[PDB]
Amino acid sequence: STPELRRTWLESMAKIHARNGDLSEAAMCYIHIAALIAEYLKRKGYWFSMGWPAFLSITPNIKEEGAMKYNENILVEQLYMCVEFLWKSERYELIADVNKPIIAVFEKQRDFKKLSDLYYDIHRSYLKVAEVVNSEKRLFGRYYRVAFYGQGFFEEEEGKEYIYKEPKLTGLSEISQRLLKLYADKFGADNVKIIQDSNKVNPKDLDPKYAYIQVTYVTPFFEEKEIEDRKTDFEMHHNINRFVFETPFTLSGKKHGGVAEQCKRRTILTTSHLFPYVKKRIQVISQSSTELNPIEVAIDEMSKKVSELNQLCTMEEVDMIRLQLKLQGSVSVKVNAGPMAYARAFLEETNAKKYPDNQVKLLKEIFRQFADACGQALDVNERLIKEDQLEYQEELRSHYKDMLSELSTVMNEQIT
Amino acid sequence: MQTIKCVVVGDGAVGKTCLLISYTTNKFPSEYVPTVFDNYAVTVMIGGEPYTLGLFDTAGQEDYDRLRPLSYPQTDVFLVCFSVVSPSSFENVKEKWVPEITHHCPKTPFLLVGTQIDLRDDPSTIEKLAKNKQKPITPETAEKLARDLKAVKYVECSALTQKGLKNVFDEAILAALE
Numbered sequence A: 001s002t003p004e005l006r007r008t009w010l011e012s013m014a015k016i017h018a019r020n021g022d023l024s025e026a027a028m029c030y031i032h033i034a035a036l037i038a039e040y041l042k043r044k045g046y047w048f049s050m051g052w053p054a055f056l057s058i059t060p061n062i063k064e065e066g067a068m069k070y071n072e073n074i075l076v077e078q079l080y081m082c083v084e085f086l087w088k089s090e091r092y093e094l095i096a097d098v099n100k101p102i103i104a105v106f107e108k109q110r111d112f113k114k115l116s117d118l119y120y121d122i123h124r125s126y127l128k129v130a131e132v133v134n135s136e137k138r139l140f141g142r143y144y145r146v147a148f149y150g151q152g153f154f155e156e157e158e159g160k161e162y163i164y165k166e167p168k169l170t171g172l173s174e175i176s177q178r179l180l181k182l183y184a185d186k187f188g189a190d191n192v193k194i195i196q197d198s199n200k201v202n203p204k205d206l207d208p209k210y211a212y213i214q215v216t217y218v219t220p221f222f223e224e225k226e227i228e229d230r231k232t233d234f235e236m237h238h239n240i241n242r243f244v245f246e247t248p249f250t251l252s253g254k255k256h257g258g259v260a261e262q263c264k265r266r267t268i269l270t271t272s273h274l275f276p277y278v279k280k281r282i283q284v285i286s287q288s289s290t291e292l293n294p295i296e297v298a299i300d301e302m303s304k305k306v307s308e309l310n311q312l313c314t315m316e317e318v319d320m321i322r323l324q325l326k327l328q329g330s331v332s333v334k335v336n337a338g339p340m341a342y343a344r345a346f347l348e349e350t351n352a353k354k355y356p357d358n359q360v361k362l363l364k365e366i367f368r369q370f371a372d373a374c375g376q377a378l379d380v381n382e383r384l385i386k387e388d389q390l391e392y393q394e395e396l397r398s399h400y401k402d403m404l405s406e407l408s409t410v411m412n413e414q415i416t
Numbered sequence B: 001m002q003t004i005k006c007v008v009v010g011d012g013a014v015g016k017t018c019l020l021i022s023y024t025t026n027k028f029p030s031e032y033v034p035t036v037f038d039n040y041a042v043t044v045m046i047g048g049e050p051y052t053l054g055l056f057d058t059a060g061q062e063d064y065d066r067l068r069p070l071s072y073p074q075t076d077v078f079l080v081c082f083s084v085v086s087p088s089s090f091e092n093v094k095e096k097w098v099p100e101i102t103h104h105c106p107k108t109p110f111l112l113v114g115t116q117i118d119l120r121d122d123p124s125t126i127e128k129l130a131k132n133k134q135k136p137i138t139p140e141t142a143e144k145l146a147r148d149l150k151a152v153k154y155v156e157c158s159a160l161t162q163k164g165l166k167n168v169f170d171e172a173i174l175a176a177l178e
Helices: A003-020 A023-043 A060-067 A071-087 A091-109 A111-128 A172-187 A292-312 A320-331 A340-347 A357-382 A387-411 B016-025 B087-104 B117-121 B123-131 B139-150 B164-174
Strands: A142-149 A161-166 A192-195 A211-220 A240-250 A262-275 A280-291 B003-010 B040-046 B051-058 B076-084 B108-113 B152-157
Touching: A003 A023, A003 A071, A023 A060, A023 A071, A060 A262, A060 B117, A071 A091, A091 A111, A111 A172, A142 A172, A142 A240, A161 A172, A172 A192, A172 A211, A172 B164, A211 A262, A211 B139, A262 A292, A280 A292, A280 B164, A292 A320, A292 A357, A292 B152, A320 A357, A320 A387, A320 B003, A320 B040, A320 B051, A340 A357, B003 B016, B003 B087, B016 B051, B016 B108, B016 B164, B040 B164, B051 B164, B076 B087, B076 B164, B087 B108, B087 B139, B108 B139, B108 B164, B117 B123, B117 B152, B139 B152
Parallel strands: A192 A211, B003 B051, B003 B076, B076 B108, B108 B152
Antiparallel strands: A142 A161, A142 A211, A161 A280, A211 A240, A240 A262, A262 A280, B040 B051
16 A cells, blocks of 8 residues: 555565466566556656546556556556566557556657557457457466465465465466375475365364365356446456355265265355456455256256267367267266166156146256257267268267157157 | 377287277276276367267287287377376386387387376375385386377376376377377
8 A cells, every 4th residue: 555565465466476487477566567657647747648547448446546546658667567478478459558657658749660569469369369369279277276274284275265366277276285285384294185075165274283275166157237348258257256166065065976965055255356357366355156956956967968978069170989979978878877867757747746737847848958959969870970980970870860769758758 | 080099009908908098988997887898989069069089998818919909000109007096007018119110110109108106195005016116107207208209298187086187188189280
């Protein structure tokens, strides 16, 4: 909250982030410095002139720079820094908003070569977006809920829940062992344990003689209303604060059960600030959760597989192996229970009397869509196989007919 | 050339499916939601371009011996799985699994995969194995069988502790690239 101390910290955080490769966080450091300088330069009559609001198009987090207790040229140099790391971090869509204030400066100077350079950079940034957007080529990060427990051990983290933004495709083993290594060295490896349970930890159940770290993979969450925005791979990682995970539980009290007792909890974690931020972890301030019935779990997983199958078929160039993976995994299940375990548990006349009519009717309709989705995937595979998968395709077809016939008995209805 | 086809075989109490779900959902083995469907897909990066790794799960029971090889055409790599605390599954690797895949796919590479390595350091398990006068398979033993059966490599993992999980599939991906 005191300008020079905040600005020094932001710069050192930027340098650290750059060494660590958290390039988005470096870029956010420089925009927060630029917003800091602009509010300071405003508060002391200097005459964008709005102060920190000048960079809201980049991120709303800069609102916190307005709790403060340096010339125009160095402000422009923080934005140069900011653009540099926006480039490296592949957040190209933001370079324009960051260069617009700089262009204003050089319009006044009549520096036409600089104006050519700046407009050219923005052109290049949008050219990159056009040739890369929505291609799964950009790896903006994986997210993890991390909670710390251990009153005798943990300092500022004790009893606190964070979302950790990890680089690229960082998997569960990577962040787990890295967090375990770091805190094992400060506390002695023999006192540090990982909580794998994704349920909210109850401290009473924990032995105080240990320090605990709870690690859970989460993904960015959006409701249908939010699908208006978030049409881009970038937009799904830009200014986000809600993350979701599901947790299994049964009707009795176990994690895992058969299909007729299997439930799940969907939990949505809301963070203190939006990612990206000047840090790669942000504290969770609230949780929202709901739970799904066994028949609601069935409905959920059946909807997903119809969408999966339908999307593979509608591709401009069908991926044959990917279609076969999902097709065989639906009509030809042999390790798991197979989708017909759901039809047995929830759609058979005698079982359907145990669930509300509207829920079984929605399940029947998704099953209809499922028969159609398998049938289409079969017809698509027929157009792609060579001689070496003729018998394979014939066996999928015979399973699909056999599944169709059993589904018809269960639903007492002609599934074609 | 968008999807790698990796076929996974082994006995049914080896924990081979719980392994693929854990790695695919990026979850500890108690936290994934049970699925009724078979097979698993994950995105892997080859030189900055996005690729799909498709994991085809097979049921290892004898009742499916006639139908399982119909999944073998177009396979890039095999994963032959056994538990390190189930000697029978390890003998079935030499006796049934490498024979079956090498007969149908003589030029396709395969890895030898040890699962449940966490139980090797488990007292109760180590005693349950004592009661039948068997001891857990050691990595040197499995590496010897790997060299003898011409496997690309031997890899070990624990789906519970996540130790060596990532390396199994890093090694599968390199083998699948031929």
